[PDB]
Amino acid sequence: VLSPADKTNVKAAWGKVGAHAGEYGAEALERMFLSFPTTKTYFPHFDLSHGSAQVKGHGKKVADALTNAVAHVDDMPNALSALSDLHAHKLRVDPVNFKLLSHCLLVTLAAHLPAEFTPAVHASLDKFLASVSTVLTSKYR
Amino acid sequence: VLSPADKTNVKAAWGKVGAHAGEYGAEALERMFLSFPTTKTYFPHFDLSHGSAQVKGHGKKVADALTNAVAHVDDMPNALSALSDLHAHKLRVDPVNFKLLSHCLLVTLAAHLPAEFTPAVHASLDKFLASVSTVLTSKYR
Amino acid sequence: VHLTPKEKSAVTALWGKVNVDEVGGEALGRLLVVYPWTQRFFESFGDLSTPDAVMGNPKVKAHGKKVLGAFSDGLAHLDNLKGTFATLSELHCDKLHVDPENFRLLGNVLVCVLAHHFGKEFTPPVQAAYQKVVAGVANALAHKYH
Amino acid sequence: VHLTPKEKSAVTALWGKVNVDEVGGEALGRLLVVYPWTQRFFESFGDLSTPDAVMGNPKVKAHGKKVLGAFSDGLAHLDNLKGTFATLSELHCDKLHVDPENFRLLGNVLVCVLAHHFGKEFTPPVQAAYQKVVAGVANALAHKYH
Numbered sequence: 001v002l003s004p005a006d007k008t009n010v011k012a013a014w015g016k017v018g019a020h021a022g023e024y025g026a027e028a029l030e031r032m033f034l035s036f037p038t039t040k041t042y043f044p045h046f047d048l049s050h051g052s053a054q055v056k057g058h059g060k061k062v063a064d065a066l067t068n069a070v071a072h073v074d075d076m077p078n079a080l081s082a083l084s085d086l087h088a089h090k091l092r093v094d095p096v097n098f099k100l101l102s103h104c105l106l107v108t109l110a111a112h113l114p115a116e117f118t119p120a121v122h123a124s125l126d127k128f129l130a131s132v133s134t135v136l137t138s139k140y141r
Numbered sequence: 142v143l144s145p146a147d148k149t150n151v152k153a154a155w156g157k158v159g160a161h162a163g164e165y166g167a168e169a170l171e172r173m174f175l176s177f178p179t180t181k182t183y184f185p186h187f188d189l190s191h192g193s194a195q196v197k198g199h200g201k202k203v204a205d206a207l208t209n210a211v212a213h214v215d216d217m218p219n220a221l222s223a224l225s226d227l228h229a230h231k232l233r234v235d236p237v238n239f240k241l242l243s244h245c246l247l248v249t250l251a252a253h254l255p256a257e258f259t260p261a262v263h264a265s266l267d268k269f270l271a272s273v274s275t276v277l278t279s280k281y282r
Numbered sequence: 283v284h285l286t287p288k289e290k291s292a293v294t295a296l297w298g299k300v301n302v303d304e305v306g307g308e309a310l311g312r313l314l315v316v317y318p319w320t321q322r323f324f325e326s327f328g329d330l331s332t333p334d335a336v337m338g339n340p341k342v343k344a345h346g347k348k349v350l351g352a353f354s355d356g357l358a359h360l361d362n363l364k365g366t367f368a369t370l371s372e373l374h375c376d377k378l379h380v381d382p383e384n385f386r387l388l389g390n391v392l393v394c395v396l397a398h399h400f401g402k403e404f405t406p407p408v409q410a411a412y413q414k415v416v417a418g419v420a421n422a423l424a425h426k427y428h
Numbered sequence: 429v430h431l432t433p434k435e436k437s438a439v440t441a442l443w444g445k446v447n448v449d450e451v452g453g454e455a456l457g458r459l460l461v462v463y464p465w466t467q468r469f470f471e472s473f474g475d476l477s478t479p480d481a482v483m484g485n486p487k488v489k490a491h492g493k494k495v496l497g498a499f500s501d502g503l504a505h506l507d508n509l510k511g512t513f514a515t516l517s518e519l520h521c522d523k524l525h526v527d528p529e530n531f532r533l534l535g536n537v538l539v540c541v542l543a544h545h546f547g548k549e550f551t552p553p554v555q556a557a558y559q560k561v562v563a564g565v566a567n568a569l570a571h572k573y574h
């Protein structure tokens with residue numbers, strides 16, 4: 001469960017991301033594809049090279065989904081219900097892969113927001129991304 | 142999330158366990174200690190040998206907690222809140238260990254209830270135990 | 283992986299009684315049903331819409347038979363699993379890109395199927411011996427990632 | 429584990445700039461804070477009640493320094509991590525019984541700390557090279573379980 005301090009920490013850290021939201025999402029995806037090449041197979045219709053407009057566009061989508069989760073942090077299953085159906089049913093994304101993207105998002109935030117990435121905020125962000133991941137994997141049937 | 146069919150399947154399978162509830166819990170613990178010896182370290186004040194009264198008694202406690210979860214399957218976080226505090230805060234149980242006990246409980250059920258352990262019921266039971274595990278690991282802070 | 287003689291004995295004795303035409307298909311079918319994301323790798327197998335469809339699917343039973351053969355092969359070379367599974371490691375890792383967590387899951391499903399078939403004969407010590415085996419096989423299949 | 433020359437270059441170049449007195453403690457402290465069950469193994473370290481208490485704890489910084497030394501040692505023997513980490517594998521597996529998933533977690537926390545310290549210098553390709561390294565170290569530390 002996310003504590004009051006966790007929600008405060010996540011909202012504050014995500015507030016600092018700003019207009020870089022989509023850019024950071026694209027960078028996390030890139031980090032994931034290079035570090036964990038098994039994840040590339042979900043994106044055959046994507047060119048996954050550096051500077052790919054497709055990865056850029058998709059990063060924005062990811063970031064917008066996370067922003068929705070932050071904005072509705074007390075109601076995340078409802079907010080993310082459609083995306084949960086997509087990832088589990090249609091796409092059949094292996095649950096292990098959410099841990100990989102979550103790690104790459106943390107690394108991206110650490111690399112761009114040094115002042116915000118305190119140990120306490122790191123913990124809060126990890127819990128938040130784990131909560132998002134739990135919702136997105138909740139619909140395998 | 143647990144579907145209507147999942148809840149039906151779990152209630153029916155657990156109904157067949159009956160007075161063997163505590164016995165099967167003890168057997169799952171034994172299977173866990175022998176198969177995954179890292180888990181033994183949580184129980185230094187226990188004699189973990191076969192026929193140990195302590196493992197028998199603890200199996201009953203485990204089974205009674207699972208029975209509570211089955212009986213309150215739509216309200217499991219509330220029902221298991223006290224046990225979540227215990228395992229995460231006080232005992233600091235590694236989350237990986239819940240997957241190990243869950244597997245040993247499935248093996249125990251498979252070995253004792255061959256007619257009930259259909260592929261569909263296996264799937265339902267796995268989802269149920271994963272849901273219980275999610276609640277019991279929800280309180281790390 | 284190192285099994286005691288008692289464990290080797292337990293494992294080999296039980297394996298002799300295994301129905302090699304069916305157990306593999308039962309384990310693969312249950313993997314597809316219990317962990318449905320694994321169906322991503324088997325779209326050419328046809329009808330996987332229901333548990334009954336999966337378990338009765340001729341391609342699932344056929345492929346499961348090949349899986350089980352590989353485990354049997356591993357049981358004969360417990361002291362050299364890496365060499366035994368080299369070609370299969372290249373296939374599952376380099377060509378298929380299966381996340382190795384799924385090797386562990388299939389192993390554990392196999393252990394459940396053995397428990398189902400053998401009942402009280404699948405004692406906790408026998409299980410512990412089989413857990414060492416399926417861990418060894420999973421680690422060997424994942425070597426190309428290491 | 430096999431790094432390309434470009435990856436070896438990336439890794440060694442960055443590691444030369446690492447503050448070896450601090451980075452280890454920062455990674456160990458963050459492990460204890462982010463994954464609090466790991467505190468079970470460090471009850472003799474004293475005050476771990478708050479993040480500030482953990483990060484300022486003299487024993488955490490001291491022990492973190494030893495961890496980092498081990499990683500440094502691994503970076504010098506990428507072609508023989510198993511031998512390099514044999515004694516540490518016996519310690520963490522046979523004596524301490526740490527679940528090996530936690531070796532992976534500490535590795536990933538180290539990667540976060542390197543990102544924090546190096547910023548845009550910690551590019552996605554540099555990260556990918558360090559992920560190979562920490563995976564190799566984790567696998568070698570877990571060998572006694574295999």
Ligand code: HEM
Binds near residue numbers: 097
């Ligand atoms: C924090 C975790 C994640 C978030 C917030 C997220 C969010 C999204 C969003 C917003 C979309 C587009 C939905 C739409 O356009 O209708 C999407 C699509 C997709 N996601 Fe994710 N996702 C996450 C994790 C993952 C992971 C771990 C994988 C696989 C490794 C993955 C694979 C895909 C694929 C393949 C698509 C469809 C791409 C396409 O066909 O254009 N996602 N995701």
Ligand code: HEM
Binds near residue numbers: 202227238
């Ligand atoms: C389905 C999962 C689990 C259930 C339902 C469960 C249930 C319980 C219950 C009912 C108790 C006794 C509570 C009390 O007496 O106040 C307990 C205690 C305990 N549990 Fe679990 N547990 C689960 C998983 C685990 C795992 C995976 C571990 C560690 C490997 C673990 C370690 C312990 C320990 C060490 C105690 C205290 C024993 C003592 O000091 O007497 N539990 N659990």
Ligand code: HEM
Binds near residue numbers: 423
């Ligand atoms: C211990 C675990 C496993 C063992 C022992 C195993 C063994 C095998 C064997 C013997 C084959 C036949 C290779 C041949 O025809 O020469 C095969 C093929 C295949 N395996 Fe597995 N396997 C394992 C895990 C998995 C998992 C978990 C997945 C996916 C979730 C998977 C996906 C596939 C696919 C898609 C093929 C067909 C490849 C082709 O025909 O081109 N395997 N495996």
Ligand code: HEM
Binds near residue numbers: 495516520534
């Ligand atoms: C890549 C992962 C790791 C590395 C490289 C590593 C390295 C080390 C080193 C160098 C020592 C000092 C040994 C000595 O004094 O000779 C040590 C001790 C220790 N480690 Fe770690 N470690 C890792 C992961 C972990 C984790 C994840 C835990 C617990 C969650 C842990 C628990 C301990 C404990 C309790 C000691 C003290 C043992 C004693 O003094 O008797 N280690 N480790």
